[PDB]
Amino acid sequence: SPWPVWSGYALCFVPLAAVILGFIIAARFTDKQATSAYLRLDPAKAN
Amino acid sequence: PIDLHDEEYRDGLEGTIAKPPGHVGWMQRLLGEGQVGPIYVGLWGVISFITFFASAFIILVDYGRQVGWNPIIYLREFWNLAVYPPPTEYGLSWNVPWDKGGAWLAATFFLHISVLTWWARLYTRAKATGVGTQLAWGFASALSLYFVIYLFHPLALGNWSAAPGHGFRAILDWTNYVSIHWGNFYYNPFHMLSIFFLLGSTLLLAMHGATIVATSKWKSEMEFTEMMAEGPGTQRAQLFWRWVMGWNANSYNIHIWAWWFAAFTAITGAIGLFLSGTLVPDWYAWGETAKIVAPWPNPDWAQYVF
Amino acid sequence: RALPLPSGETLPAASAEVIPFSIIEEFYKRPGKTLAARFFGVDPFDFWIGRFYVGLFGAISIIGIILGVAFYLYEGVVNEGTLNILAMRIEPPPVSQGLNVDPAQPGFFWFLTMVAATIAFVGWLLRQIDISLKLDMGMEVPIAFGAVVSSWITLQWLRPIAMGAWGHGFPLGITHHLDWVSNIGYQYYNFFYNPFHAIGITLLFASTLFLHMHGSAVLSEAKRNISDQNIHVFWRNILGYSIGEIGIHRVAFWTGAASVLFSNLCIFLSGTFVKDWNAFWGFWDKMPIWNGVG
Amino acid sequence: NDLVPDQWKPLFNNAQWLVHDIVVKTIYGGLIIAVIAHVLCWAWTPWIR
Amino acid sequence: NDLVPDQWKPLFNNAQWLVHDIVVKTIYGGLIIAVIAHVLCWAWTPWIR
Amino acid sequence: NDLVPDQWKPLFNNAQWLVHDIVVKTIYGGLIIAVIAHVLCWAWTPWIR
Amino acid sequence: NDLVPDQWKPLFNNAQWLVHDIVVKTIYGGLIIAVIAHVLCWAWTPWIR
Amino acid sequence: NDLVPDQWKPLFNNAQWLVHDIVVKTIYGGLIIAVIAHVLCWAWTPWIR
Amino acid sequence: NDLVPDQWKPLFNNAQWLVHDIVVKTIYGGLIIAVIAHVLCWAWTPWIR
Amino acid sequence: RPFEFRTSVVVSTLLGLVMALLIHFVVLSSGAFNWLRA
Amino acid sequence: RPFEFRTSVVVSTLLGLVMALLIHFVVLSSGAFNWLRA
Amino acid sequence: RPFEFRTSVVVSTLLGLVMALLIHFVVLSSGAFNWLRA
Amino acid sequence: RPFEFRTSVVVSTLLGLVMALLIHFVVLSSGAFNWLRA
Amino acid sequence: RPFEFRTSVVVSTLLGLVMALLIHFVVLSSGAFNWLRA
Amino acid sequence: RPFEFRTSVVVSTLLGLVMALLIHFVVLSSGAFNWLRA
Amino acid sequence: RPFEFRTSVVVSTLLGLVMALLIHFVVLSSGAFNWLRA
Amino acid sequence: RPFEFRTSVVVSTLLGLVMALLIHFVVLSSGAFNWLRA
Amino acid sequence: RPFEFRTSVVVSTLLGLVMALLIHFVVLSSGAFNWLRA
Amino acid sequence: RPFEFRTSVVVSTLLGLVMALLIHFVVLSSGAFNWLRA
Amino acid sequence: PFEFRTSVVVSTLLGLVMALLIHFVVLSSGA
Amino acid sequence: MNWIVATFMLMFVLVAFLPLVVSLAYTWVTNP
Numbered sequence A: 001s002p003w004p005v006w007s008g009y010a011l012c013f014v015p016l017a018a019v020i021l022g023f024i025i026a027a028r029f030t031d032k033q034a035t036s037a038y039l040r041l042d043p044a045k046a047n
Numbered sequence B: 001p002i003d004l005h006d007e008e009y010r011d012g013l014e015g016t017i018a019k020p021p022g023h024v025g026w027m028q029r030l031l032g033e034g035q036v037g038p039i040y041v042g043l044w045g046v047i048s049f050i051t052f053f054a055s056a057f058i059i060l061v062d063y064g065r066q067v068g069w070n071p072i073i074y075l076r077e078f079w080n081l082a083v084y085p086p087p088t089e090y091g092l093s094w095n096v097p098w099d100k101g102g103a104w105l106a107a108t109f110f111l112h113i114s115v116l117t118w119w120a121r122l123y124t125r126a127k128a129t130g131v132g133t134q135l136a137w138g139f140a141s142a143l144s145l146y147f148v149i150y151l152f153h154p155l156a157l158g159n160w161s162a163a164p165g166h167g168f169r170a171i172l173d174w175t176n177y178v179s180i181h182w183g184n185f186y187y188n189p190f191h192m193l194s195i196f197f198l199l200g201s202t203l204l205l206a207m208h209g210a211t212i213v214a215t216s217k218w219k220s221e222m223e224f225t226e227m228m229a230e231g232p233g234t235q236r237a238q239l240f241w242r243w244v245m246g247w248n249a250n251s252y253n254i255h256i257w258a259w260w261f262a263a264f265t266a267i268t269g270a271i272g273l274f275l276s277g278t279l280v281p282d283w284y285a286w287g288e289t290a291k292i293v294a295p296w297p298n299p300d301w302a303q304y305v306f
Numbered sequence C: 001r002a003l004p005l006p007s008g009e010t011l012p013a014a015s016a017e018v019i020p021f022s023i024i025e026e027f028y029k030r031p032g033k034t035l036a037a038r039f040f041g042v043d044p045f046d047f048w049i050g051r052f053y054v055g056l057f058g059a060i061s062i063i064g065i066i067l068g069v070a071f072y073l074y075e076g077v078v079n080e081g082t083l084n085i086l087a088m089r090i091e092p093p094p095v096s097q098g099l100n101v102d103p104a105q106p107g108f109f110w111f112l113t114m115v116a117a118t119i120a121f122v123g124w125l126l127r128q129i130d131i132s133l134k135l136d137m138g139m140e141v142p143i144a145f146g147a148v149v150s151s152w153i154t155l156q157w158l159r160p161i162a163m164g165a166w167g168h169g170f171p172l173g174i175t176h177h178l179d180w181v182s183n184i185g186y187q188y189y190n191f192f193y194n195p196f197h198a199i200g201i202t203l204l205f206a207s208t209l210f211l212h213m214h215g216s217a218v219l220s221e222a223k224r225n226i227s228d229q230n231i232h233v234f235w236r237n238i239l240g241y242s243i244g245e246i247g248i249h250r251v252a253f254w255t256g257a258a259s260v261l262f263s264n265l266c267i268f269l270s271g272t273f274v275k276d277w278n279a280f281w282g283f284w285d286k287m288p289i290w291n292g293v294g
Numbered sequence D, E, F, G, H, I: 001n002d003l004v005p006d007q008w009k010p011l012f013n014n015a016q017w018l019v020h021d022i023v024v025k026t027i028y029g030g031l032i033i034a035v036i037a038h039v040l041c042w043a044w045t046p047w048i049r
Numbered sequence J, K, L, M, N, O, P, Q, R, S: 001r002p003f004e005f006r007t008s009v010v011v012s013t014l015l016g017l018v019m020a021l022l023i024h025f026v027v028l029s030s031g032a033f034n035w036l037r038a
Numbered sequence T: 001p002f003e004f005r006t007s008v009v010v011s012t013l014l015g016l017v018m019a020l021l022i023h024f025v026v027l028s029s030g031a
Numbered sequence U: 001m002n003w004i005v006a007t008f009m010l011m012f013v014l015v016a017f018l019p020l021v022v023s024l025a026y027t028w029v030t031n032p
C-alpha cells in the first residue's frame, strides 16, 4: 500500500538512474579526452 | 586506389543519369556550395523508385474515385482525403472490398519494399566510395520505429485498423486517437524518455551549429582537417564552453554525442509504443499505482471554461 | 615514435605539435574585455574561480539560482508535505485573485520562484554574451539561447499579462506541468490543426534528421586515408546535392532557432484571439473558385 | 578459371561455377518438396472449390 | 591453406574449414532435436485437425 | 602462441585458450544446475499438463 | 609480472594479481553470508509454499 | 615512495598509504557506531516481528 | 614547506596547514554547539517518544 | 551500343513482377471468384 | 563482367523469402484452413 | 574472396534466432496448447 | 597563495545576503507575527 | 589588494538601488498602507 | 589479455549492486513477508 | 599531492550547508514541534 | 598504476552517502517507527 | 542588359495561363450562365 | 546529339503505361460494364 | 581614472530607466 | 484595455522573432 508497485521500478527508475549515470560517465570521458594532450597548432602563430 | 572521376561519371545502372552539372546561384550566396551536379542510379536505385511510384499511384487514383473524378472538388478537398485500413470486422483478413480497405494493403506493401531497397542503396553506395557505413545503421534505427507503427503493432493486436491512413490530416488523427485510446499517453515513461532525447537532440544541433558558425572566422568549419591538427578556431571553441559550463569536448566526441542522441530518440520511441496495446492497457491508471500522479483534490476550473 | 591525435588515434610518426592544454588557456585570457566593463569602465569580479568565469552578470544569476531552488523546495515540501518531487505541485495564484499578488494569499511563493528564475536566465544570457566578447568569436550562441529564453518569457509573462489572470502560467513541478499542457491543448480543440504549431513540430523533426545525418557523415570519415572529397562525392550520389562544410552549420543554427519562435507565437495567439482551431479553417471550403461546384 | 565449359566461359569464373551447382541442386530439391506439400494441402481441403 | 580438398580449394581457407565442420555438426544435431520435438507436440495435440 | 594444439593453432592465440577453458567449464556447470532446477520445478507443478 | 604462476603469466600482471586475490576472498565471504541469509528467511516464511 | 610494505609496493604510492589508513580507521569507527544504533532500534521496536 | 610535521610533510604545503587548523577549530566549536542545541530541543519535546 | 541490355532486363522483370502482383491483389479483393472462403 | 552472379543470388534469395512469408501470412489470415484454432 | 564466409554465418544465426523467437511467441499467444495456465 | 581573500569576502557577502532575504520571506509568509496587516 | 575604489562604488550603488526598489514593491503589494487606492 | 581486467570488475560490481537493489525492492513491495509494518 | 585540499573544503561546506537546510525544511514541514504557529 | 586510488575513494564515498540517504528516506516514509509524529 | 528577355516571356506566359484558368473556374462555379447543365 | 533517342523511348513507355493503367482504373470503377460482379 | 563622461552617461541611463519604470507603475494604478 | 495590451505583447513576440532575420541578412551581405 505505501510502496510503488513492481514495474514502477523497472519502467521509471531504469530511466531515472540509467540516464543520469550515463550522462555523468560520458561527460567525464569526453572531457578527459578533450582536455588531454595531443596535436594542436600554436596560439602564438596560427592566431 | 579509388578513382573518384570513374565514380562520378559512368553511363547507366553503374553510373549517373544527370551528367551535366548545374548551378543554383542563390544557394551559392547563402548556403556555401551551390551546384546540383549528377545523381547516381544503381540497381537498388531503380527498384525503390518504381515501387514508390506504384504505391503513390495506387493512392492517388483512389483519391479521385472518392470525389467522383471531379478535378475542381479534387483540388479543393485534397488535404483531408485519405484511404483507411480495414475495419475491426475481418480484423486481419486480407480479403476485403477494394473501396472499404483493400487499396491500403497493396500501397503499404509497395511502400515497405521501396524503403528496404533504399536502405540497401545507402549501404552499398557508402561502401563503394570508401567511407564508413554509419548512416545506413542510423536509418535502420529509424526504420525500427517505422516498422513498429505500420507492421508490428497492428499485428499482435489482431486489427489492421490500428495503422495510420495515408492522408495529410490522417496522421494527426492517428496520433490523437491512439493517445486517447490508451488513456493519458503523457504518463507512458518511454514516451518521456523519447521526448527527453528529442529535445536534447535539437539542443545539441543548435549549439554545435551556432558555435561553429561563430568561430568560422578562423576556418574551424572544416571538421576533417581539424581532426588531425587543431587550429586556433577549435582552441577557442573549447575555451568558450569550458568557462560557461565547466567542461567541453573536442571535435571528435561531439559528433558521437550527436549520433547517439538522434538514434536513442527513435529506439526508445519504438519500444514505448509497442508496449501500449499489449502489456499496459491503461497508462494513467498505471501511473496512480506507481505514485507519480499529482493528487489535485480540488482544482480551480474557472480558468478552463470561457 | 607515436603522435597522439585529437581523435584518440596514435599515429606511426607540419606546424602542429603536441601542446598540453594549459598553455592554450593562459594565452587566451586577455582580462578586461567584458561587455559590462565597457559601460562602467570596469568589471567588479572577472576572476575565473575554478573553471568558471565570473562577471557582474554571473553574480545576479547565481543569486537567482539559489533563491529559486530554495523557494521551489519550500513549496511542495512545506505547506504540501508530500515529500515526493513527482507528487508535489507548485501552483500559481488563482484566476479570481487577478493580476495583483498578496503575501497572505496562496501562490505567493510560486511568483517568487518564477521571478528568481527569470532573473537567473537573463543573467546567464548576458554572461554568455560577455564570455564570447572576451574571445572575440561572434554572437551566434547568444542569439540561439535568446530564442528559447523568449519562449519562456512568452509562456510565463506575456500571455498571462495579456489575459491578466496570472493563473495562466504553467504550474511548476514534475509530472504536473504535463496536466496543464493537456488541459490547455484540449481547451482549444485540434491544437494539431493549428498552423503555427505544425511548423514547430516540422522543424523539430527536421532538426533531429539533420543532426543524425551530419553526425554519421563526420563519423564515417573519421579515421581513414581519403581525399576529403569522398564525402562530397557520396553526398552527390545520394540525393544529388552536397551542402558543403560551412553550409550545414548555418542550417542547423537557423532551423533550431526558428522552431521555438513559431511555437511561442502559436501559444500566445491561441490564448488571446482564437477560441477553437476547427472554426479557423471554416473559410477554406467557401473559397469562390469552388464554393458552388459541389 | 578453366573448369567451366566453353559455351559459358565468358560469364562464369571458376569459383562462381561450384556455387551455381549448389544453387541448382537446392532449387530442384525445394521444388520437389513444394510440389509434395501442395498435393498434401488439397488432399486435406481444396482451396479453389 | 592446404587442408581443404581440391574441389573446394578456391573458396575455403584453412581456418574457415574447421568452423564449417562445427556448423554442419551443430545443424544436424539441431535438426534431429527439432524433428523429435515436433513428433512430440503432435502426439500431444495435433494442430492441423 | 604454442600452447594450443595443432588442429586449432590457426584460430586460437595462446591467451585466448585459457579463457575458452574457463568458458567451457562455466557452461557445463550452468547446464547441470539448469537441468536440476528444471527437474525440481516439474516435480512441484508440471507446466505441460 | 613474475609473482603470478606460469600458467596464468600471459594474462595477469603483477599488480593485477593481488587485487584478484582480494576479489576472490570478498566473493567467498559474500556467498557464505548470502547462503546464511537465505536459510534464515526461509525458516521465517517459505516463499515457494 | 618506500614507506609502504613490500607486498603492497606496486599498488600504493607513499602518500596514498596514509589516506588509506585514515579511511580504514573511519570505516571501523562507523561500523561500531552502526552496530550500536541497530541494537538500539531493535530494543525499541523490532522490525521483523 | 617546512612548518608542517614530518609525518604529514608529503601531503600538506605550508599555507595549507594554517587553514587546516582553522577548519579543525571551527568544526569542534560547531559540534559543541550542535550537541547543546540537540539537548535543548529534546528537553523541549522529544521526537522519538 | 547506346542501350544497355541489362537495364532492359532489369526494368522488364520489375515491371512484370509488379504487374502480376497488382492483378493478383485486385482479383482477390474483388470477391468474385469464391477463392479462399469467398 | 556485365552481370555479377552474386547480385542475382542476393536478389533471388530475398524475393523468394519475402514471397514465401507473404503467402504464408495471407493463407493464415484468410481463415479457411482450420489451422491453429480455426 | 567472392563471398565472405563470416557474413553468411552472421546472417544465418540472426535469421534463425529471430525465426525461432517469432514462432515461439505466435504459438504461445494463440492459446491452443494449454501451456502455462491455458 | 592557497586562498584569495577577495573570493572569501565575495562568497561571504553573497551567502549572508541571500540567507537574510530567505529568512525575512519565510517569516513574513508564515503569517504568525501580525506584521503589515496580519 | 585586489580592491579598487570604483568597483566598490559601482557595486554599492547597484545594491542600494535594487534594495530600495525591492522594498517599495513589497510594501506596495502588501496592501497594508492605504496608498494609491487601497 | 583479450580483456582489460578493470572493465570486468567495474561491470561486475555495477550489475551486482543493481541486481541486489532490484530484488530488495520487489520483495519489499510484494507485501508477503510482514517486514516494516506489513 | 594526491588530493587538492581546497576541493575537499569546498565539497565539505556545500554538503554540510545543503544537509542543514534539508533537515531544517523537513522538520519545519512535519508539523510536530509547535514552532511558528503550529 | 592500473587503478587510481582516488577514483576508488570518490566512488566509495558517493555510493555510501547515497545509500545512507535512500535507506533513511525509505524508513521514514514507511511510517512504522513512530518517529517525528507517527 | 538590365533584363533578360526570356525571364519576361516565362513570367508572362505563366501569369497569363494562371489568370485564364482562375477566371474560367470562377465563372463556371458562379452558376450564372447555364453552361454544362446549369 | 540534340535529342537522345533513349530519353524518348523511356518517357514514351512510362507515359503509355501510366495512361493504360489510369484508363483501366477509371473504367473499372465507373461500374458501367458488368465486369467482375457488376 | 575617472573620465567624468562615464559618470554623467550612467547617471542619465539610470534616469531613463527610472523614467519609464516610475511612470508606468504610477499610471497602472487603481486611483 | 484587453486589446491594447494584447497588441503590445504581440509586438514583443515579433521582436523576439527579429534577431534571426538580422543573422540571415548579415550572412547574405557579408558573403558576396
Ligand code: BCL
Binding pocket: B175, C121, C148, C149, C151, C152, C155, C181, C182, C184, C185, C186, C191, C192, C197, C200, C201, C204, C259, C260, C263, C264, C266, C267
Ligand atoms: C493535447 C496537447 C497538444 C500540445 C500542446 C502544446 C502546448 C500547450 C504547447 C506545445 C508546445 C510545443 N509542442 Mg505541442 N502539443 C501536442 C502535441 C505535440 C507533438 C506531437 C508529436 O504530437 C509535438 C512534437 C509537439 C511539439 C511541441 C513544439 C511545437 C513545442 C515545444 C516547446 C518548446 O519548444 O518550447 C519550450 C521552451 C521553454 C519553455 C524552455 C525554457 C527553458 C529554460 C530557458 C531553461 C531553464 C533551465 C532549467 C531550469 C534547466 C536548468 C539546467 C540545470 C541542469 C538544472 N506537440 C498536443 C497535441 N504543445 C509548447 C510551445 O509552444 O512552446 C511555447 C506549448 O506552449
Ligand code: BCL
Binding pocket: F030, F031, F033, F034, F035, F037, F038, F041, O008, O011, O012, O023
Ligand atoms: C519460477 C520457479 C523458480 C525459478 C526457476 C528457475 C530455473 C528452472 C532456473 C532458474 C535459473 C536461475 N534463477 Mg530462477 N527461478 C525462480 C526465482 C528466482 C529468483 C528469485 C527472485 O526468486 C532468482 C534470484 C532467480 C535467479 C536465478 C539464477 C540463480 C539463475 C539464472 C542464471 C542466469 O540467468 O544467468 C546467466 C547470465 C548470463 C548468461 C551471464 C552471466 C554473467 C557472468 C557470470 C558475469 C561475469 C561476466 C564476465 C565479467 C564477462 C563480462 C561480459 C559482459 C557482461 C558482456 N530465480 C523461481 C522460484 N530459475 C536458471 C539457472 O539456474 O540455471 C543456471 C534455471 O535453469
Ligand code: BCL
Binding pocket: H030, H031, H033, H034, H035, H037, H038, H041, P008, P011, P012, P023, Q009, Q010, Q012, Q013, Q014, Q015, Q016, Q017, Q020, Q021, Q024, Q027, Q028, Q033, Q035
Ligand atoms: C530510523 C531510526 C533512527 C535512525 C537509524 C539509524 C541507524 C540504525 C543508523 C543511522 C545512521 C546515521 N544516521 Mg540515522 N536514524 C534516525 C534519524 C536520523 C537523523 C534525524 C533527522 O533524526 C539524522 C540526522 C540521522 C543521521 C545519521 C548519521 C548520524 C548516520 C549516517 C551516516 C551516513 O550515512 O553517512 C555516511 C556518508 C558517507 C559514506 C560519506 C561521508 C562523507 C565524509 C565524512 C565527508 C568527508 C569527505 C571527504 C572530504 C572526501 C570527499 C569525497 C566526497 C564525499 C566525494 N539519522 C532515526 C531516529 N541512523 C547510520 C550510522 O550511524 O552509521 C554510521 C546507522 O547505522
Ligand code: BCL
Binding pocket: D027, J016, J017, J019, J020, J021, J023, J024, J027
Ligand atoms: C482468371 C482471369 C482473371 C485474371 C487474372 C490474372 C492474374 C491473377 C494474372 C493475370 C495475368 C495476366 N493477365 Mg489476366 N485475368 C483476367 C483477365 C484478363 C484479360 C481480359 C479479359 O481482358 C487480359 C487481357 C488479361 C491479360 C493478362 C496479361 C496482362 C498477364 C499475363 C500475360 C502473360 O502471359 O504473362 C507475361 C509473361 C510471363 C508472366 C512470364 C512468366 C515468367 C516465369 C514463367 C515466371 C515463373 C515464376 C516462378 C513461379 C518463380 C519461381 C521460378 C524459379 C525458377 C523456381 N487478363 C481475369 C480477370 N490475369 C498475370 C500477370 O500478369 O502476372 C505476371 C497474373 O498473375
Ligand code: BCL
Binding pocket: D026, D027, D029, D030, D031, D032, D034, D035, D038, D041, D042, D047, E027, K016, K017, K019, K020, K021, K023, K024, K027
Ligand atoms: C496449401 C495451399 C495454399 C498455398 C500455400 C502456400 C504457402 C504457405 C506457400 C506456398 C508457396 C508457393 N506456392 Mg502455394 N498455395 C496455394 C496455391 C498455390 C497456387 C495456385 C492454386 O494457383 C500456386 C500456383 C502456388 C504456387 C506456389 C509457388 C509460387 C510457391 C513455392 C513454389 C516453389 O517450389 O518454391 C520455390 C523454391 C523454393 C522455395 C526453394 C526452397 C529453398 C530451401 C529448400 C528452403 C529451405 C528452408 C529451410 C527450412 C531453412 C533452414 C535450412 C538450413 C540449411 C537448416 N500455390 C494454396 C492457397 N503456397 C511457398 C512459397 O513460395 O514460399 C517459398 C509458401 O511457403
Ligand code: BCL
Binding pocket: G026, G027, G029, G030, G031, G032, G034, G035, G038, G041, G042, G047, H027, O016, O017, O019, O020, O021, O023, O024, O027
Ligand atoms: C528471502 C528470500 C527471497 C529472496 C530475496 C533476495 C534478496 C533481497 C536478495 C537476494 C539475493 C540473491 N538471491 Mg535470493 N531471494 C529469494 C529466492 C531466491 C532464489 C530461488 C528460490 O530460486 C534464488 C536462486 C535466489 C538467489 C539469489 C542470488 C541470485 C542473490 C545473491 C547470491 C549471492 O550470494 O550473492 C552474490 C555475492 C555477493 C552479493 C557479494 C557481496 C559483496 C559484499 C559482501 C557486499 C558487502 C556490501 C556492504 C554492506 C557494503 C558496505 C561494505 C563496506 C566495506 C563497509 N534467491 C526469495 C524470494 N535474494 C541478493 C542479491 O543478489 O543481491 C546482490 C539480494 O539482495
Ligand code: BCL
Binding pocket: I026, I027, I029, I030, I031, I032, I034, I035, I038, I041, I042, I047, P016, P017, P019, P020, P021, P023, P024, P027
Ligand atoms: C530538534 C531535534 C531534531 C533535529 C533537528 C536538526 C536540525 C534543524 C539540524 C540538525 C542537525 C544535525 N543533526 Mg539533528 N535533529 C533531530 C535528530 C537527530 C538525530 C537522531 C535522533 O537520530 C541525529 C543523529 C541528529 C544529528 C544531526 C547531525 C547530523 C547534524 C549536526 C551535527 C553537527 O554538529 O553538525 C556538524 C558541524 C557543524 C554544522 C559546523 C557548524 C559550522 C559553523 C559553526 C556554522 C556557523 C554558521 C554561522 C551562523 C554562519 C555565520 C557565521 C559568520 C562567521 C558570521 N539529529 C531531531 C529531529 N538536527 C543540523 C545540521 O546538520 O545542519 C548542518 C541542523 O541544522
Ligand code: BCL
Binding pocket: S016, S019, S020, S021, S023, S024, S027
Ligand atoms: C471498351 C471501351 C472503353 C475504353 C476502354 C479502354 C481501355 C481499358 C483502354 C483504352 C485504351 C485506349 N483507348 Mg479506349 N475506351 C473507350 C473509349 C475510347 C475512346 C472514345 C469513344 O472516345 C477513345 C478515343 C479511345 C481511345 C483509346 C486510346 C487513347 C488508347 C489505346 C490506343 C492505342 O492503340 O494504343 C496505343 C498503342 C499501344 C498501347 C501499344 C501497345 C504496346 C504493346 C503491344 C503492349 C503489349 C503489352 C504486353 C501485354 C506486355 C507483355 C509483352 C511482353 C513482350 C510479353 N477509347 C471506352 C470507354 N480504352 C487503352 C490504353 O491506352 O492503354 C494503353 C486501354 O488500356
Ligand SMILES: [Fe+3]
Binding pocket: B208, B223, B255, C218
Ligand atoms: Fe561538426
